[PDB]
Design a protein around this ligand. Sequence first.
Ligand SMILES: [Cl-]
Ligand code: NA
Lengths: 150, 556
Amino acid sequence: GWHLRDTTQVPSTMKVMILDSGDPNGPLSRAVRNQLRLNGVELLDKETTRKDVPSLRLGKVSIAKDTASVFRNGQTAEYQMIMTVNATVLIPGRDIYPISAKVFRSFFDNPQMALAKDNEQDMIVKEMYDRAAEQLIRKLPSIRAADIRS
Amino acid sequence: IPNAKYTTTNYFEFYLPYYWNIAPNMDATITPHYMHRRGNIMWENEFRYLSQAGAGLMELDYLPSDKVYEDEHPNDDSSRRWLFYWNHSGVMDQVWRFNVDYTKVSDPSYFNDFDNKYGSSTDGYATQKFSVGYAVQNFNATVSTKQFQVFSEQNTSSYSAEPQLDVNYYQNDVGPFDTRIYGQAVHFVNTRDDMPEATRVHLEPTINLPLSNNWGSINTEAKLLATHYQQTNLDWYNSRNTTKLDESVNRVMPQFKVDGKMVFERDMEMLAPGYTQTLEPRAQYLYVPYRDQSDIYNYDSSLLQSDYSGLFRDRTYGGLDRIASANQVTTGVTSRIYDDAAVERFNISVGQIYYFTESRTGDDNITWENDDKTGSLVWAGDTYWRISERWGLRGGIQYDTRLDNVATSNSSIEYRRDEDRLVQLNYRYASPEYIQATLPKYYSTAEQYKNGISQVGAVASWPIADRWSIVGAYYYDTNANKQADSMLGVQYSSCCYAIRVGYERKLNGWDNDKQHAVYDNAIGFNIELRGLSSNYGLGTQEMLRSNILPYQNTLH
Ligand SMILES: [Cl-]
Ligand code: NA
């Protein structure tokens, strides 16, 4: 017993919103802007004295690459990248609800081609940058809901 | 306040360090690290700094000589052991990006014999990168230099990018269209001087048309892949392999791609009052033509993996020296579940790629377990379940019908309450058919690798009497039937001191005269005084991430 979706992934109080970030031209703020755009959101600048506008204040990322498996000899068989991203969303009327996202990819190593493999990484890290952005878009409905109680 | 520990590597180790607040921004920490089994003091030297140009950290470790290192190569000019590490990152005025990940060591053994603070016993190479870039909203350019200390003496043949320069333009109000263009130039060089040098300019403009609905989505993507190679020093390489590399080489090709996405909702009234569910399918068509790239020596293109997200991805490889003759259609599905609080309690995704043609690059000599060239050759699936507030489970799998077999897969299940009170089990698999394919011959045909991966983990911590806190973790390769990493730790704490002590038996090498695995042991006290900041967690986390297969938390 299905039906097709009757709004976008983003609430309607956030069709207009600020993207406050400590690093406008970073590779996070790059890939977030692009994701809100892909739900048709009106991004403002933090100059606007206009109002009713919530403000997604992005926070800082972090990326371990952790050894995550080992051959019999003890030399990392398989690393795993782990991106951790902490944001907040301010609501002008009300309150601060801090949200976040974490991604895992993982991959095998090969010293014989260590250069190739460092490349693979950059990509995976890049890819993650978007995967993260999305996880945050998918958490906005949960800010929208749990707030209405108070 | 000093520390000590006993290790098989060094027997009595102890490390008695004096910190220096040079100013704000900067400070030091100079540390005599006495090593009995070696008969000298390593001089560990840390420097941290701060600026507008971000922060960075530097380490110089100097062992002036080593008993144990002189006794295995006695007729050597010297016997010292050292390491230098530099970390930097910083964004100046949002526009200027500076970064360093530098690591250099006196020898292959350095992370076995001494501490895994910046490096690790687990690593196989030392990463040596510098990079400066310039980035704005619609544009970013970046130059860098990537070199690699390969450790084991199977081969020292490392390719390095000195330098590499990536450029990226983005235009999105070209009416209904969107455009990016990317340009890259790099020059590849090898530590052995009897190997191909090469230079490689590459351009890739991309235009696509993205279509916004309230319940659907389609983009369509047109792209060219123009690349010119110059390749010196091909006298040696061309006498070993039949397939010649040509000095100047050109390879241009384009790509039609298209991606469809649908969103169906419903309500889980049957199972839960006031729940939700979404369910999304997806398809990608991807066409890229064959080019005979066997005239290019692969420098930076290694085979990528395909987790479910990575099915919907337009590259078999990283880098740019190998691109596949893609003709194929990917299909996948993503059921999600929300609750009364719009919180994602569960998802699951499965996908597959049907290939109409082969996917080749003229250099297709990877050893698969059969002949299938087409059809549903690749499958993947992850899944997340948040059974409970305190409980969850994750897992996923990558399948390939060219292996007859799973490639790789990874389970997790977790209990958490707080950062002091938690348990986790975990398991990764990797087929010895996958190791044969994705890795070199001697991995495939020597004991320690060939038999793949099968790996079982337990990790936990119980807070006892508030002041105490136990930690530990058993990791276990099941195929060979052996321990890999095993740690036990204990942490007494209070509002003026925090004494910590633990144990690690880890894998640390492979003996070729007996051809069995060699382990290392380590036990030691480690202390500090609380009070002068709000540093009042019972200190579990630091300890969980000390072990060589560090603790990775799964969601909340
Ligand atoms: Cl060690
Ligand atoms: Na690391």
